[PDB]
Amino acid sequence: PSLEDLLFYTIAEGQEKIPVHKFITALKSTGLRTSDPRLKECMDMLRLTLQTTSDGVMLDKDLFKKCVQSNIVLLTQAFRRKFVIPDFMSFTSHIDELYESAKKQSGGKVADYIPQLAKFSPDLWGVSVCTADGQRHSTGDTKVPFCLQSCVKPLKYAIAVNDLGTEYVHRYVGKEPSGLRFNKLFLNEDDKPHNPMVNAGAIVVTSLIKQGVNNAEKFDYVMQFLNKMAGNEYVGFSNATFQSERESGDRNFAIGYYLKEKKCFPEGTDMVGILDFYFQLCSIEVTCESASVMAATLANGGFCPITGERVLSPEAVRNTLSLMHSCGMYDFSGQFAFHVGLPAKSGVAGGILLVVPNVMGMMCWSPPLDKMGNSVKGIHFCHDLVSLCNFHNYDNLRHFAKKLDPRREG
Amino acid sequence: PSLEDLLFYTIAEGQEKIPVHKFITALKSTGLRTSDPRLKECMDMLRLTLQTTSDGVMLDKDLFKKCVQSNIVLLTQAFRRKFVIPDFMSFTSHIDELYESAKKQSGGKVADYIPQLAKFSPDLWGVSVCTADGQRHSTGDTKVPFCLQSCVKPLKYAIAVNDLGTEYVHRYVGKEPSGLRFNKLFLNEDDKPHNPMVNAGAIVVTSLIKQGVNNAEKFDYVMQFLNKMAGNEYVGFSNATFQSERESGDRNFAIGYYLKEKKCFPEGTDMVGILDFYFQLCSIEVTCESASVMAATLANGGFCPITGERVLSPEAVRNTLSLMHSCGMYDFSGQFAFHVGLPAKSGVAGGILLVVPNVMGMMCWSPPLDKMGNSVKGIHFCHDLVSLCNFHNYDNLRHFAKKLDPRREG
Amino acid sequence: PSLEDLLFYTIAEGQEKIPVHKFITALKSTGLRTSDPRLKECMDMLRLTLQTTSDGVMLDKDLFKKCVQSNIVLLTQAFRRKFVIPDFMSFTSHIDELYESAKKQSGGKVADYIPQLAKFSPDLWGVSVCTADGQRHSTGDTKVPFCLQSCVKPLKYAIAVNDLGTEYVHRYVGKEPSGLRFNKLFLNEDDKPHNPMVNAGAIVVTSLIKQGVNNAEKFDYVMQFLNKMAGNEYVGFSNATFQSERESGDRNFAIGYYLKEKKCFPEGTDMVGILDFYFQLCSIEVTCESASVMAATLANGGFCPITGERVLSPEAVRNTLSLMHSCGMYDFSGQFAFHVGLPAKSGVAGGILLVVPNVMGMMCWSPPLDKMGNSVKGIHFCHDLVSLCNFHNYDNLRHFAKKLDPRREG
Amino acid sequence: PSLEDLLFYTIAEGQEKIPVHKFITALKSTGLRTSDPRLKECMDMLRLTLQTTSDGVMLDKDLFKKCVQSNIVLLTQAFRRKFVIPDFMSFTSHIDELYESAKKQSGGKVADYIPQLAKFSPDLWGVSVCTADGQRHSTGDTKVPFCLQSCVKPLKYAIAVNDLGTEYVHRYVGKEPSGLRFNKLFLNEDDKPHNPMVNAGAIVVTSLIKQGVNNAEKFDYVMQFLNKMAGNEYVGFSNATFQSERESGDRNFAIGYYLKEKKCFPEGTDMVGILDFYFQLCSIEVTCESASVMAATLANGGFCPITGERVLSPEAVRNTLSLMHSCGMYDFSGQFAFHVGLPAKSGVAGGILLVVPNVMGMMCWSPPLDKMGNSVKGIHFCHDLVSLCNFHNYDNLRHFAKKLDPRRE
Ligand SMILES: Nc1nnc(N2CCC(Oc3nnc(NC(=O)Cc4ccccc4)s3)CC2)s1
């Protein structure tokens, strides 16, 4: 026996030849994209032989082995239906319907407090999925850059705990939600901001990362870190939204000065620089696709699903998922956790970074917000999704009524 | 082939016939108790044939065949290492280590608010486990009765939603936590109590179950309900603590009138009578073993794991597990959700009702309370337990660092 | 010289005789009512001689002397324009203008929570004046009885401090106002109700008066006390409004139990009896005339203006006038203290008990309330009144712009 | 009759000439200082004739007439015991006892947050009085300069209402006290600061004075105003404490931006410039004497008692006294209003600006603060004073038990 050969006959079909395009679409049906980083050596070997023998590019048992031996373990888990979602093909056709039904929630208002999000059309709407195994699906305007805005907070919280530990980080930031009419206070009674998902705690968390280097290097470190979380997919930066956030951040300076007087930053902090770093981190640009991979990184215990690298310590990813659950969706956090029960974080640009732990990561984007600051179509999508699949954090994996479970077969 | 025959060879060793005790301890090693209701027909036939021929109590292939013939499916998941916890034996010696570790947290104060909770010794400490498949382990004082006190709040919430639906119930009770600065208010900003786990919201929920019958039938309806959740193990009632709870409930009467004034009960409610039914529900008695079966019922999508009947609709168990997470441990709810991340509920008698969804239910019981009203040893046990097992709601089931996973084998 | 001789010539006209009506009309022009208690002996001696000599009916110097001998000190200070308001008659024609200007404020809502306050017509409106010297004026429906409701709180506070002292009384009740979204709390941070002018503190003050006797004796004592304060003018009681206050006082029972749980009553308090005494005290009845005398008792350092008896210790009246200033007009206290600056107290029946210290006491009564619970015309009158006279607590008695000062001559 | 002659015989005492010093101590015994501005023409004429004839300094009837003719109206109310406090001589010996009783309350902590108020010794303590008629008394360390700090807030409130009116001003600042549970918020429920006496409300009121001018003239405008309130007595400015307030006002800058975010300033306001003007107004310095004249100005319906000049409209002085009563002493405002019942304002330098309407104005000064920020000795003095005299806003002027009435004989 041999694994690459047994895999050859699984796809060879009993036939003696594999047309390689038949291999490529058998591959994409896994949901894996041809461009997957864990697959490069095999596509290197495929683009090589698509030149060597332009004569009927069918692969025999020996030549197929010559391309896929290097990636055979991941190719076989893909083809022996061992990924977290075995029938990915049907699942995307449910993701499509959920996308198209949220696509008719035309209500809401595009945040216009800056001219940069004000120029974004209300008709943009994209949903991107990446599972814990790297299966990909996207639908809508999923390659348009937009800023993370307030979706950056868990990402930077993760880095801070990843680099410094839970106990150090939470001397400066609380670990609970305020209370639905305490969105107006900055501090809890330990004179600590309530949690990293609000502007007060975000400004404090920003204060802890890479102390002692300048703001240019600090930003560099976060970009390198956010690069690994998305498996080197698109991470960018909008200078335009940066300047309009620095000229308009009256409430943020208010928070900085309040935090400075009440001695909530670590020793030797330059408060006004931290606010400039903060406005920077909120105009890091993503797409629906790249950011869905970062979301899958947290769904996966801190291991990037399309590269296999350890990017965050499991302690950092649990804390962040805990704190997204409670505090992630403004005054809709409490109701969102009850009805949807998925760690999620929203942003002023209309993004929702969603995690379904041990299944998949996601990013939704439609600019128009509802009156609580959450993307209209984005929020409508996350309801239908939990309505449909037993992904609610406190669903039962065995008895779950008329819901669907994508992690099983028949 | 056929099922009773193949298992026979697994236990037979290739020997003879199986000595009946060798079958029994092989059975108990799964963690099932001989008393399991799903096993009654099989133990009835073994006690019969242990009479039919008293010389030579060993079972050949045909005699074993018709003793386990009726319960063969559950016997096979038991013997084929298919229960949710395969090595129950090693795991229980981990529960014992955790138990003996919390047993040295001698601090705290036994609630003295009535002479009935004061009558409990501080060195009582019991932990009882019930998995979603019915494997059991107990350690410590797990047969001593005590009242649920506030551990009854999610149970009646579940019953209320099970009978009435999410939409009706949450017209009278909110679904979020107060906020560590609203632990003293009764009503949230819609003049609904904040959630079913606070005394105000509990009292409101009590006003909803089985409206229109008298308090005697109402009690019967809730007790019959709790009997199915505990698979008919001990569910009792302390009249003694009841008399002390009704004479000392000034704050509850205080809550009762305020709710009446602001019309938070359903029409035709007898407020002062609803307050008696409430005091009753707080002195229903359990032991650690009986109540751990109640907790496993919620871990199990609403199916009693040791009897198999459906007791609660998945909507009832999800909502209840959502709100135990957020609002379950008094003002320690936030830290508990962050650090332990498991649905749980405490009571002033020293109970902690714990749920690890899709795995097991638990009840920890030591009377001495800490400074927030949560049992000292209970809270220490529930910290160590998540430190040890990847049970924190947001652990990753694939990458979980040096934690143990009892759901996996070698 | 001799005083009664001096006074005869002031009225005598240079003439022989003074006709008896000419004395009476000279008397009422002082503003004193002939029925004044400090005048009884003189009108007694007048009704004596209106029989002795039915044909006169003029008094010579020896006979005028025989009627005014007994009351001469008070009669001349009246006639030598030594009363606090020298030209009382012109002053009453300004009170008439103020009354007639508020009488065109037709808005507001009559409190309907009990059927007894709902039966009062919205077109009832009365203003009654009694100065620190006993000059009286009334305009409108000033002899219609109505309940004090919440106007009773200072009256009983005065009695409590009068009998027990500031230091004892204020172990149970604060001395400050809450804060304008804290109309909803019961206790301040020291577990004391905030001040005697809110229902929580009122109920507690009610617990201090005449401890150790039953509720019938306790009420009797307060009636005897309110009797001296109104100089034996009309104080009555509506059992009707009492019965609807006890059947509808859910918030007060709510407050009663909260206070009992937090141990805010004095030892040996029967909580439920205290609430019954409280409902009684709010259904004491007055008219505009009768109650304005109580207000003058507070305007006069604790001495009843129409009897001269010391009824309250000066400590009792300052405290009460202090707390009426801060806390007297529901959420309108702050606005009322700024713009009107007079110690005042309102009630849900539409009463306003007003004090201009060292000048006069008042009672306004119109049933229709504004949106904060204060009678429309009562509030409109008190604005117009302070607009007109330098009566605002922080007016200057020497430089007061274009305002009128009724205590001066020309 | 003749006004000047009638006085001559009252002090002449049956004699033919009045020794000029005998006139002088009879003058000062009313409590007037010879330095009174309303008396200048009369003292000018006295030292002139004290030169014209260095010959036996006694005054006959016709020469006395020519000295006080110009100021005779004020001299007669002084000598016919018609001032608001007739026996000023006995009363000041009550102020002295009250002073020496507060002087032994050694508790409290001198504010140390800037090295400039930390530079003040805790044993400094001074009480200065000014009546509505100009009678003066001082005792203790009453000529030591110190900054008004938060004692300036009602002064600038008054100036804003005097210049703008109650209604305009209170579109930006509330009129009630927070509530002993709202000492940490900036805004009340209408997104307006609670009242002019808190840092948030003061900062906004500061935003209303003399809009459209630069900060240099704005200061000039406020100073000219404070000079008239003190009758041109000492009003200064500490640059030293100013620089330290600009470096350490993190919480004030915190208030500035929050107010900017919530649109609580008038249009075209430069917030950060307003904050420097604010720190400027908070380190204007007074002595106990000069500022005691400011307090009497508010006691006097807006007329400076020692010059006769109208400085504030009665609308501005009433509002300022209403709000001093309610909101004037940090978290002690409630108890202070109950037990003392007098308009007052404190500052972190150890000042208490006190007003007894229609009687007198005052300034107490001892640096060490109690835990609420109010001078220890000052609060002890203001209690003792009201225990003694029926000045409590709601004492009764007719029946007041064992208290004194200095307005009586
Ligand atoms: N009308 C308005 N809206 N929002 C307003 N703000 C309120 C003041 C803010 O500064 C502070 N915020 N919370 C503070 N509270 C604490 O630190 C201790 C603490 C005590 C009790 C409970 C929770 C914590 S202090 C700025 C924004 S004011």
Ligand SMILES: Nc1nnc(N2CCC(Oc3nnc(NC(=O)Cc4ccccc4)s3)CC2)s1
């Ligand atoms: N939405 C709603 N409106 N009204 C509601 N109430 C129901 C229950 C409430 O009980 C209490 N009232 N005041 C309390 N305050 C204290 O004990 C001391 C204290 C500590 C710290 C800071 C302030 C004060 S506790 C009464 C009103 S709930």
